[PDB]
Coordinates of C-alpha atoms and ligand atoms in Angstrom, one line a residue:
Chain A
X1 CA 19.0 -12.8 7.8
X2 CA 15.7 -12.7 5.7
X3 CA 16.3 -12.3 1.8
X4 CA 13.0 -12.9 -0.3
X5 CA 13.0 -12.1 -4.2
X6 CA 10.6 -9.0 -4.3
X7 CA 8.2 -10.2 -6.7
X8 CA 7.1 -13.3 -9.1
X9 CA 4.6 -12.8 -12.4
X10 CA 2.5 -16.0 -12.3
X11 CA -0.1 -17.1 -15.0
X12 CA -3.1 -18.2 -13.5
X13 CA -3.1 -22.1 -12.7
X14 CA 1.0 -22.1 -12.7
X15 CA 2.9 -22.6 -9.4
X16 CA 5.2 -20.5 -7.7
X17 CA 8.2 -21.4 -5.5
X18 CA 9.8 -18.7 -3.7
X19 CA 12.9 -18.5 -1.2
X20 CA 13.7 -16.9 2.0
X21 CA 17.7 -16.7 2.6
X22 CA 19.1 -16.4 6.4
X23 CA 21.6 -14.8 7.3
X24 CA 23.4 -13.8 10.9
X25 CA 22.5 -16.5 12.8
X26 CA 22.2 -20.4 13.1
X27 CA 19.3 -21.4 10.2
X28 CA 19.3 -24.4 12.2
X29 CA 18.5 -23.0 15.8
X30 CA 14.6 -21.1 15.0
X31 CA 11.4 -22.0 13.4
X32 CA 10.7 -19.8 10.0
X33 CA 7.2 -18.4 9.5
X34 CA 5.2 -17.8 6.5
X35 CA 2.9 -15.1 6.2
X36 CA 0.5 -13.8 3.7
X37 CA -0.7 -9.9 3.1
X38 CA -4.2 -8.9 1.1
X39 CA -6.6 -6.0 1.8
X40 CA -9.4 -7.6 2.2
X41 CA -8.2 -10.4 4.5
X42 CA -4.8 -8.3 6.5
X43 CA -1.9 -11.2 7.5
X44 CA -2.7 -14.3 7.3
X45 CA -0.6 -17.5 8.8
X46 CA 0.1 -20.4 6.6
X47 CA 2.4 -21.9 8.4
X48 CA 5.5 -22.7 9.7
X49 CA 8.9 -25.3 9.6
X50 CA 11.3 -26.0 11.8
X51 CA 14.8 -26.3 9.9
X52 CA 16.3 -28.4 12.6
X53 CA 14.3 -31.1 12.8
X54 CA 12.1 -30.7 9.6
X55 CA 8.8 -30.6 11.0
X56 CA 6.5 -28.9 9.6
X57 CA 2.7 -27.3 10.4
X58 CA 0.3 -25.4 8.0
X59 CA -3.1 -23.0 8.6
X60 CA -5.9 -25.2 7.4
X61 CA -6.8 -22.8 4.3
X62 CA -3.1 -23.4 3.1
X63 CA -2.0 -27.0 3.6
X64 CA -3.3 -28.5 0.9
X65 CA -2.0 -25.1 -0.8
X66 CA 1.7 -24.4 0.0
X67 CA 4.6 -26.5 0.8
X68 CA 7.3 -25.7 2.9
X69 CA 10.9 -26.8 3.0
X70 CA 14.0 -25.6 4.5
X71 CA 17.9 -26.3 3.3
X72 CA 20.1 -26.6 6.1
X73 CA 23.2 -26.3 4.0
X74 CA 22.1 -23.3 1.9
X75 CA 20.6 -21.6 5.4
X76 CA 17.8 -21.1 3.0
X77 CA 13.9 -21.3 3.1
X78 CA 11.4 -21.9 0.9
X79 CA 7.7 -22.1 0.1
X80 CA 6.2 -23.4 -3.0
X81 CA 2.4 -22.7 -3.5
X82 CA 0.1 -24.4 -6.1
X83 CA -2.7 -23.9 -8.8
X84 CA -2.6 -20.2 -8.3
X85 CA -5.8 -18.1 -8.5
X86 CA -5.8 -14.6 -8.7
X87 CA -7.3 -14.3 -4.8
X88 CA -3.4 -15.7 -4.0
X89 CA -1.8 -12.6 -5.9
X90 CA -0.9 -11.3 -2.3
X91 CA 2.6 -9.9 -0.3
X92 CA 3.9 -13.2 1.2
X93 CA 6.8 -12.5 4.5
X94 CA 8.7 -15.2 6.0
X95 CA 9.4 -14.5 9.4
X96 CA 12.2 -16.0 11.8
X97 CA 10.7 -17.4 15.2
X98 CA 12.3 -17.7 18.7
X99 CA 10.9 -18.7 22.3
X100 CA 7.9 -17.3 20.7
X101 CA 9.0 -14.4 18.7
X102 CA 8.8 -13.6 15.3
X103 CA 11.6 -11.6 15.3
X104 CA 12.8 -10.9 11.9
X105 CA 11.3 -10.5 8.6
X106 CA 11.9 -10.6 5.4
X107 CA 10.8 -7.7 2.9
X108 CA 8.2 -9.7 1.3
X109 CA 7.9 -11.4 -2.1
X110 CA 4.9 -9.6 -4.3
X111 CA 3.2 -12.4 -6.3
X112 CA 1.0 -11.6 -8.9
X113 CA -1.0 -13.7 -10.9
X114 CA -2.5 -12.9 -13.8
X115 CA -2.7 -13.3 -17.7
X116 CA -1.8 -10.1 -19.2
X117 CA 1.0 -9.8 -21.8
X118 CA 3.5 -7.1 -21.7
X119 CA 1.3 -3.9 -22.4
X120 CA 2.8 0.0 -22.9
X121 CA 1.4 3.0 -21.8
X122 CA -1.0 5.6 -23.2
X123 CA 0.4 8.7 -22.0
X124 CA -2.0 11.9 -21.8
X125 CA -0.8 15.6 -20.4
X126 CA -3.4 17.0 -17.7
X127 CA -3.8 20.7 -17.7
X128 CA -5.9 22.7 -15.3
X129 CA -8.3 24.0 -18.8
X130 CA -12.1 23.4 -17.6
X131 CA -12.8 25.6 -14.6
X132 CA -9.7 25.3 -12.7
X133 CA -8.5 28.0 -10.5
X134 CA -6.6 30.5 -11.4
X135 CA -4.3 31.6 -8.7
X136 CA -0.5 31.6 -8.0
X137 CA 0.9 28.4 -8.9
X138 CA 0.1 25.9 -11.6
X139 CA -0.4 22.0 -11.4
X140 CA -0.1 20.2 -14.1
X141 CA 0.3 16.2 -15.0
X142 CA 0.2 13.1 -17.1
X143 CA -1.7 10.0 -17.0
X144 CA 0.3 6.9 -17.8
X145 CA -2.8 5.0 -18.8
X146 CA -2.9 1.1 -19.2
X147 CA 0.8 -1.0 -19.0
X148 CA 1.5 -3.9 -17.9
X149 CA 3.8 -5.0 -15.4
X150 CA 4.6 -2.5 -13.5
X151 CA 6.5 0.0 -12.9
X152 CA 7.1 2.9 -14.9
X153 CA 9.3 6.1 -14.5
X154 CA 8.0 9.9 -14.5
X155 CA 10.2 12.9 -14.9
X156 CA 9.5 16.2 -15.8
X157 CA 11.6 18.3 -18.8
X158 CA 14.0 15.4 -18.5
X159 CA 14.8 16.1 -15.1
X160 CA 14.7 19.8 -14.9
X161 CA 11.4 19.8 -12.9
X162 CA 12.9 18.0 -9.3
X163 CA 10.7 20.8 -7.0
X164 CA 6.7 19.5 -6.2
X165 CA 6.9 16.3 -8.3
X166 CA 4.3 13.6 -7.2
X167 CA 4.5 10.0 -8.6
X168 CA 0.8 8.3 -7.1
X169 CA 0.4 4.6 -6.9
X170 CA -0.8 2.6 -9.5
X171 CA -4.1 1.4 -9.8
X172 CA -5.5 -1.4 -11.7
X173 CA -8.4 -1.5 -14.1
X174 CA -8.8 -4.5 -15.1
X175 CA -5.4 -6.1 -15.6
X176 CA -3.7 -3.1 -16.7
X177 CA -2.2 -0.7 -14.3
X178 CA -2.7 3.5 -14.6
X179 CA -1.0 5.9 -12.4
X180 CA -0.8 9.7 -13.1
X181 CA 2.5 11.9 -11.8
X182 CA 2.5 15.7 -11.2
X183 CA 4.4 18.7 -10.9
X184 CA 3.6 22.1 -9.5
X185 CA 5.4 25.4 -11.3
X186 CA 5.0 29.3 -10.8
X187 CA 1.8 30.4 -13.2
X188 CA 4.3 32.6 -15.0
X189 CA 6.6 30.0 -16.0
X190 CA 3.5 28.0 -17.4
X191 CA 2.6 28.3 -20.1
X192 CA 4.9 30.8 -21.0
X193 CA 8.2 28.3 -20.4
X194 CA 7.6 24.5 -21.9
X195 CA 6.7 21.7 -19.2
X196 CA 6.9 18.3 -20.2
X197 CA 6.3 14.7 -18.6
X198 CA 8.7 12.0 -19.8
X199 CA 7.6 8.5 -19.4
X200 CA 9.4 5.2 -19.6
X201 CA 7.9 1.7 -19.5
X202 CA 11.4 -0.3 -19.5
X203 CA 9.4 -3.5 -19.5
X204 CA 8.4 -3.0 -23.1
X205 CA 11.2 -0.5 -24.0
X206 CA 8.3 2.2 -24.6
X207 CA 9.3 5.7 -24.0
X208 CA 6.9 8.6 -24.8
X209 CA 7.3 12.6 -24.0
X210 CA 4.4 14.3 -23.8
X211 CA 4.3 18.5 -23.5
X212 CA 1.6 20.2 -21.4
X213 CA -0.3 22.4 -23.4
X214 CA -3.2 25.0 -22.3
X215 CA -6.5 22.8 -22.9
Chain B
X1 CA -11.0 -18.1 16.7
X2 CA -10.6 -14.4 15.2
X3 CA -8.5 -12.0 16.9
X4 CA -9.3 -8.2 17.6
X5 CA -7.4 -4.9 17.5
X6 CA -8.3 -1.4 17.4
X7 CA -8.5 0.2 14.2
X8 CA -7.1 3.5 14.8
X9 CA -5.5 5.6 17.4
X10 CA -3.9 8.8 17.5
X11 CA -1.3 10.4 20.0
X12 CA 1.2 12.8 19.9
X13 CA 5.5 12.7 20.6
X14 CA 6.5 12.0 24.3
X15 CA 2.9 10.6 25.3
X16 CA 1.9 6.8 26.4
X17 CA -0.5 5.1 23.8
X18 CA -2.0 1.9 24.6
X19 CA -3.3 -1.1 22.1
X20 CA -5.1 -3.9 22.9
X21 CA -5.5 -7.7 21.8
X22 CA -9.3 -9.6 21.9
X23 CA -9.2 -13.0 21.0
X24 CA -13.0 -13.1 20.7
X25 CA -13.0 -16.3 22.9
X26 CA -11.1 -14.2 24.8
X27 CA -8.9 -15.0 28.1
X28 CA -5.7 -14.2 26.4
X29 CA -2.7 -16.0 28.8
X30 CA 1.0 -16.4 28.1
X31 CA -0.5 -19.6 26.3
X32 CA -0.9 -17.6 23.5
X33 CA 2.6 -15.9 23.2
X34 CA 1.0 -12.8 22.0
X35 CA 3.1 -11.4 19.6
X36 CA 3.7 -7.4 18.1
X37 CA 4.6 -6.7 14.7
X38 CA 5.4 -3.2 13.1
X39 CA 4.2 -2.4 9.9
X40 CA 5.8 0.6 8.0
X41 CA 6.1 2.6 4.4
X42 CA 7.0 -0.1 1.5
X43 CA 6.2 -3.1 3.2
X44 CA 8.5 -3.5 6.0
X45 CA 7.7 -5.2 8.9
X46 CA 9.7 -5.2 12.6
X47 CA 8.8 -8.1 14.9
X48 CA 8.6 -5.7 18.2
X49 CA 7.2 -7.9 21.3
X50 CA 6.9 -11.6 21.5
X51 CA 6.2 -14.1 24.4
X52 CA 3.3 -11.9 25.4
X53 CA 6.5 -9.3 26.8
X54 CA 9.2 -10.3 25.6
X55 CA 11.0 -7.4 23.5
X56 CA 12.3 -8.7 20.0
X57 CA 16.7 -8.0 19.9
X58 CA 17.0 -4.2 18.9
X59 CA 13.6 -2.8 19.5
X60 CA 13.3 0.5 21.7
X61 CA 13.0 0.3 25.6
X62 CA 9.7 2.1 24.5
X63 CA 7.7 -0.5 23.5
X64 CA 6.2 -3.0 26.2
X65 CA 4.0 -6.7 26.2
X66 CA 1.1 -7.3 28.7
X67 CA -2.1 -8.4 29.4
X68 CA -4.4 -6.3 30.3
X69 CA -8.2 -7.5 31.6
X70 CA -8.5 -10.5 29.2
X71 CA -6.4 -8.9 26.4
X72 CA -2.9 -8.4 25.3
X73 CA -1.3 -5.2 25.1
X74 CA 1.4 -3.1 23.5
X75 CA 2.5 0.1 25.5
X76 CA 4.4 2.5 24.1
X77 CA 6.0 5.1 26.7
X78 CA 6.9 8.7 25.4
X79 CA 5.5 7.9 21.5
X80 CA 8.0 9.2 18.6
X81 CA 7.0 10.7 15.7
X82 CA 8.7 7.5 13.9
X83 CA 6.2 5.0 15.8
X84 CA 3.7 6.3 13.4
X85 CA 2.7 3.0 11.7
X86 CA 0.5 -0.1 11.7
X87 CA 0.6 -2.2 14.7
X88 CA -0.7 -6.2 14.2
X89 CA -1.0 -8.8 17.5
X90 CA -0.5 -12.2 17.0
X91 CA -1.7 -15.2 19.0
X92 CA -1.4 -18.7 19.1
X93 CA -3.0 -21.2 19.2
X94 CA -0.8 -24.7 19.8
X95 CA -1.0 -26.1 16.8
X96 CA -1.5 -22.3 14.7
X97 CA -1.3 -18.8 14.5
X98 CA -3.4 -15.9 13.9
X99 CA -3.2 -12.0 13.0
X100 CA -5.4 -9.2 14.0
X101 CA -7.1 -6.7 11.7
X102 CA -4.2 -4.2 13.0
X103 CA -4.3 -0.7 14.2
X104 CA -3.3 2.3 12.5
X105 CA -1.1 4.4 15.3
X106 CA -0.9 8.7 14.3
X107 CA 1.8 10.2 15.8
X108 CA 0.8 14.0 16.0
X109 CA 4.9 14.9 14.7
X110 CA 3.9 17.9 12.8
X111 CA 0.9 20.4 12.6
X112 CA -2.6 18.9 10.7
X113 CA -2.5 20.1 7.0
X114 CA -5.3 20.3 5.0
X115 CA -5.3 18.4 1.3
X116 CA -4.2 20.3 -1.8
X117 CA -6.9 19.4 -4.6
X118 CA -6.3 19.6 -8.0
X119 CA -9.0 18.2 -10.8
X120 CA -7.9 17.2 -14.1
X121 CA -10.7 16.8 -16.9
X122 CA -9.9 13.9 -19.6
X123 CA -7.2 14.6 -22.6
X124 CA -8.4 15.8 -25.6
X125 CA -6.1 12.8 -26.9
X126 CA -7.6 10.7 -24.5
X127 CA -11.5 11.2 -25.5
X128 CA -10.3 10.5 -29.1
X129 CA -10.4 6.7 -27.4
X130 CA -14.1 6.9 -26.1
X131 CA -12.8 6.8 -22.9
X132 CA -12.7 9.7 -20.2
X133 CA -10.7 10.0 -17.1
X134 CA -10.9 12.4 -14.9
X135 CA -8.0 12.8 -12.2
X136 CA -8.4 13.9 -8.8
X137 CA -4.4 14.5 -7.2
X138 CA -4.6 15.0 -3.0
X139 CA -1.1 16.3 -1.3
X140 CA -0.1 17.0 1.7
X141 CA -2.4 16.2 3.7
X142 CA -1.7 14.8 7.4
X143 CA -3.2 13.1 9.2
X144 CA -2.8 10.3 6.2
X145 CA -6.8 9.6 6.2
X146 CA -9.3 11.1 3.4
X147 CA -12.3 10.1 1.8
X148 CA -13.3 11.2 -1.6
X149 CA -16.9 11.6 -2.9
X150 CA -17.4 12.3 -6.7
X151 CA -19.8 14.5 -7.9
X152 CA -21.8 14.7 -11.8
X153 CA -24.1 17.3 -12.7
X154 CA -24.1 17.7 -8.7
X155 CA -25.4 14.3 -7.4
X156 CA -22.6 11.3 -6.2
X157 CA -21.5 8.7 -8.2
X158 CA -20.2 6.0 -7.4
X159 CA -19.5 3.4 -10.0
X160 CA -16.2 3.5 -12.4
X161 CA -14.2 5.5 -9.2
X162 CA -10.6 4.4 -8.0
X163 CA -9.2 5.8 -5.0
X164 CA -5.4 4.9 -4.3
X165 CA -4.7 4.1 -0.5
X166 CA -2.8 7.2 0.6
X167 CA 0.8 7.4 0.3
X168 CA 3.1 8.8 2.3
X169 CA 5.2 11.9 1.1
X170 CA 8.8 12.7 1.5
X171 CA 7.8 15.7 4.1
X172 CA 6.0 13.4 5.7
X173 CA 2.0 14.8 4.9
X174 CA 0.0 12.3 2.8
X175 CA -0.9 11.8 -0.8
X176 CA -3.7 10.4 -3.0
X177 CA -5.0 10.1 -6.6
X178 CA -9.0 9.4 -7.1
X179 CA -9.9 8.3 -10.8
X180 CA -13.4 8.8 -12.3
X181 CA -13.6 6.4 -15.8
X182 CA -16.3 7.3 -18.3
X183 CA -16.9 6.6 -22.0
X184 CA -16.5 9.7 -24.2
X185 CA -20.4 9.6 -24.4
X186 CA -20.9 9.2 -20.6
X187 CA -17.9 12.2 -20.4
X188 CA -20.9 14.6 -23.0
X189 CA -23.9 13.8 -21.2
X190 CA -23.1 15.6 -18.2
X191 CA -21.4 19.1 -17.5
X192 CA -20.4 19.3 -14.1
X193 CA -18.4 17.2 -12.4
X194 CA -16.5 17.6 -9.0
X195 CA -13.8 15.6 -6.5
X196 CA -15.0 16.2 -3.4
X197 CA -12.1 15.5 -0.5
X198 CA -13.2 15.3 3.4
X199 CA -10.7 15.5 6.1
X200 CA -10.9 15.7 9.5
X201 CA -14.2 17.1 9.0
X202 CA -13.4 19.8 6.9
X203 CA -14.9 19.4 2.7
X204 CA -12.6 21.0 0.2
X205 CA -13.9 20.0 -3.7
X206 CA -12.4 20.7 -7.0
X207 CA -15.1 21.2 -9.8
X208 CA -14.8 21.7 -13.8
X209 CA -17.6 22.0 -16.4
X210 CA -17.5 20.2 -20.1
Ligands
LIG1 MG1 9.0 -24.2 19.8

C-alpha cells in the first residue's frame, strides 16, 4: 500500500517532489494524507487529496508551500514542496484515510536540505587512558568525526568483534554529521590482543582503519 | 486550536493504561473523528483507532477509542511489552487536521537497569586539529529516559554539548552518546572534566583529568 523513497538531499531554495505508491487496495476509493515530522514542532498536517474526485485541502502554513496530486492510473501519490529552507528538512508520511481513519502509512521520506558537499570522515580511536576505571572489561571506540551525507559503517577487527558493539546516532555540528561506535572486550585481551575500528563512508568511497592503542 | 496529550506514562504487561485527548477548546465529539496513531523504532507509524473508536483493519482487540469527560481516549486492556511506543491523537477540524504533542507509553517488560558510562577524553590525533571532543557512551539503560549534565574543573557546562535522543538496543535497554566540543586550548585550560548521567533518580558520572 504506502511506498515513499526514504530520503531526498535538497539544496536550499531547490524544490522537492516526492511520491507515495499504493498498493492492496482501490487508490481510487480513500483520501491520502500528508504529514510532516520535526522535534521541535511533532506531526504536523499539511494536507490532504482525494484521488477520486481530485479535490484537494491544505493546512494554512503549507498551501502556499506544497502541492499535492494523485495519479489514478499509476495508483500513485505525490507531493511537491517549494523554495525549501532548512526548517522544512523534516520526516514527511503520507497516510491512507477511510470513514475517518488514517489507516496506513507509509515509512516516511527523510528530506534534508542543506548545502554541504560530499565530506569524509576524520576517524579517531577512543581509549579509556585519562582516569578511567580499571576493572574487568575494557571499552573502547572511534569517533567518525565530520562526513557528509550520512551514513557510515563501523566494524570492529573486520568483523571479528560482533559481541558488545554499539553504533550511536549521528549528530550534526554544523552541517557535518559525527557519530562514535563501541565495543566492549575482556581487559586481558586489550591491549594485549589488537582491537581495531574499521570505517567506511561509501558516499565518498573513504575507508579508514584505525587501531586502539593505550593513550 | 492546539490539541493536548500526556507526555509520558508508564505501566507494566497485562495492566490497563489510559491516554487522553484535550483540544484546548475542548468538547471533543465524534465531530472530530479523533484519531490514534502508533509511533515506533525507525520511524514507523501504525494508524491504531480512528472515528473516535473505530479500530484501524489489523490492530489488537487491545486497543480501544472513547471520550472520556471532554476528551478522547485510547485504552489499552492487558498492555504488552510491544505497546511500548509513542502514542499521537488526532482531531479534526472540517476543513483540517491536527496532531498532539504525543505521549511516550513504558511498558515495564523487563527489570529497570541502570546506564553503563564510559568517558572518552579527545585523540591525541584529534587535538593535533585544535579541536577536542570528549565522548560520553550510555548503554543499557531502561527505562529509555536520561539526562546528562557535563562537568569542567567541577562546575556544569553547558555550551558546545550534544546529547543523541536515546536509541533503543537490540536487548531492548536504551542507548546514548553525549559530545562535549572544545578547542585544543579550551581542552588545556581545564583538568577535570566529568559526564554526569541521572536516571531514575539515581547519578552515576564518569570523570578523567588532562
Ligand atoms: Mg470524507
Amino acid at each position: 500500500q504506502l511506498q515513499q523513497p526514504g530520503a531526498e538531499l535538497v539544496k536550499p531554495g531547490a524544490s522537492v517532489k516526492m511520491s507515495c505508491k499504493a498498493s492492496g487496495y482501490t487508490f481510487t476509493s480513500y483520501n491520502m494524507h500528508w504529514v510532516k515530522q520535526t522535534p521541535g514542532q511533532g506531526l504536523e498536517w499539511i494536507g490532504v487529496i482525494y484521488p477520486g474526485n481530485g479535490d484537494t485541502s491544505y493546512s494554512q502554513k503549507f498551501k502556499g508551500k506544497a502541492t499535492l496530486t494523485a495519479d489514478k492510473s499509476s495508483s500513485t501519490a505525490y507531493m511537491q514542496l517549494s523554495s525549501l529552507t532548512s526548517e522544512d528538512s523534516a520526516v514527511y508520511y503520507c497516510s491512507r484515510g477511510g470513514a475517518g481513519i488514517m489507516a496506513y502509512w507509509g515509512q516516511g521520506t527523510s528530506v534534508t536540505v542543506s548545502s554541504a558537499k560530499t565530506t569524509p570522515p576524520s576517524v579517531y580511536p577512543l581509549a579509556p587512558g585519562s582516569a578511567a576505571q580499571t576493572n574487568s572489561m575494557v571499552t573502547l571506540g572511534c569517533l567518525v568525526k565530520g562526513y557528509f551525507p550520512e551514513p557510515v559503517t563501523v566494524t570492529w577487527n573486520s568483523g571479528s568483534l560482533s559481541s558488545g558493539v554499539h553504533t550511536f546516532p549521528a549528530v550534526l555540528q554544523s552541517d557535518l554529521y559525527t557519530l562514535s561506535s563501541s565495543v566492549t572486550v575482556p581487559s586481558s585481551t586489550w591491549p594485549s590482543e589488537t582491537v581495531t575500528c574499521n570505517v567506511a563512508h561509501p558516499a565518498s568511497s573513504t575507508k579508514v582503519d584505525k587501531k586502539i592503542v593505550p593513550r | 486550536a492546539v490539541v493536548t496529550q500526556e507526555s509520558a506514562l508508564t505501566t507494566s504487561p497485562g495492566e490497563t493504561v489510559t491516554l487522553t485527548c484535550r483540544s484546548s477548546t475542548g468538547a471533543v465529539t465524534t465531530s472530530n473523528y479523533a484519531n490514534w496513531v502508533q509511533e515506533k523504532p525507525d520511524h514507523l507509524f501504525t494508524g491504531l483507532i480512528g472515528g473516535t473508536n473505530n479500530r484501524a483493519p489489523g490492530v489488537p482487540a487491545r486497543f480501544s477509542g472513547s471520550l472520556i469527560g471532554d476528551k478522547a481516549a485510547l485504552t489499552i486492556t492487558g498492555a504488552q511489552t510491544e505497546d511500548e511506543a509513542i502514542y499521537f491523537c488526532a482531531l479534526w477540524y472540517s476543513n483540517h487536521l491536527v496532531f498532539g504533542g504525543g505521549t511516550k507509553l513504558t511498558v515495564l517488560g523487563q527489570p529497570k537497569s541502570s546506564p553503563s558510562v564510559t568517558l572518552f577524553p579527545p585523540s591525541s590525533e584529534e587535538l593535533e586539529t585544535n579541536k577536542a571532543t570528549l565522548v560520553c557512551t550510555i548503554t543499557d539503560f531502561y527505562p529509555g529516559v536520561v539526562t546528562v549534565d557535563w562537568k569542567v574543573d567541577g562546575t556544569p557546562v553547558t555550551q558546545g554539548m550534544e546529547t543523541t535522543q536515546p536509541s533503543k538496543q537490540s536487548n531492548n535497554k536504551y542507548m546514548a552518546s553525549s559530545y562535549l566540543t572544545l578547542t585544543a586550548r579550551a581542552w588545556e585550560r581545564h583538568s577535570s572534566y566529568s559526564c554526569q548521567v541521572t536516571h531514575e533518580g539515581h547519578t552515576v558520572e564518569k570523570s578523567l583529568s588532562r
